[PDB]
Design a protein around this ligand. Sequence first.
Ligand SMILES: *CCC(=O)N1CCN(c2nc(OC[C@@H]3CCCN3C)nc3c2CCN(c2cccc4ccccc24)C3)CC1
Ligand SMILES: Nc1nc2c(ncn2[C@@H]2O[C@H](COP(=O)(O)OP(=O)(O)O)[C@@H](O)[C@H]2O)c(=O)[nH]1
Ligand SMILES: [Mg+2]
Length: 167
Amino acid sequence: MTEYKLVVVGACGVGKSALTIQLIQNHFVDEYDPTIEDSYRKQVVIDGETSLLDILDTAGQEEYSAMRDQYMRTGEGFLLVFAINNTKSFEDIHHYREQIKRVKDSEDVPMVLVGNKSDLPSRTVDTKQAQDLARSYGIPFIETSAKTRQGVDDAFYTLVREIRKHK
Ligand SMILES: *CCC(=O)N1CCN(c2nc(OC[C@@H]3CCCN3C)nc3c2CCN(c2cccc4ccccc24)C3)CC1
Ligand SMILES: Nc1nc2c(ncn2[C@@H]2O[C@H](COP(=O)(O)OP(=O)(O)O)[C@@H](O)[C@H]2O)c(=O)[nH]1
Ligand SMILES: [Mg+2]
């Protein structure tokens, strides 16, 4: 059975853990421990294909040991996550995409831009700002809520479709 190694990246507080746990365990977590970095497995079906998803929810501390490089490099696709009510988190996306390109030593790595917390009023990042960042990377943009499940399957599934295209 085909396995997909997906890595969820982005600033603290954007909902990497809440999206990963909504997908895998179908509930919404308040203030998940930001020190906990885990891998989560899920049998799913995308375009009629029963696949195994191996999903790394990144956490802890920013650090660049060989060992961290090697654990991130196992990633076949990346969710670049920001929160639509957090402009600083959107302005950090470029950093995560640069570190992805470095450890994969490639200008073409399957990625999806995810604008999370779309159930919230008082958005500070507009749809157009995030569609233009994603068009600048040649990658898709999907709007999610870890809380209502809006777009959650579609963000993960769209990343899988990106990895298939790369093959
Ligand atoms: C709140 C806890 C949490 O979820 N995380 C801690 C911060 N983590 C993290 N943060 C950054 O950068 C923070 C900002 C952005 C610009 C400079 N800095 C002030 N960068 C990374 C991480 C996780 C580890 N990262 C990393 C290490 C090695 C290789 C790669 C390759 C590809 C992507 C990331 C890599 C970078 C994580 C979340
Ligand atoms: N309303 C709402 N809150 C969210 C969403 N995603 C995450 N949160 C909350 O935002 C906070 C940070 O999310 P968390 O999953 O810890 O993000 P992480 O640090 O990137 O893993 C927690 O209190 C979450 O419950 C969302 O889509 N909508
Ligand atoms: Mg977390």
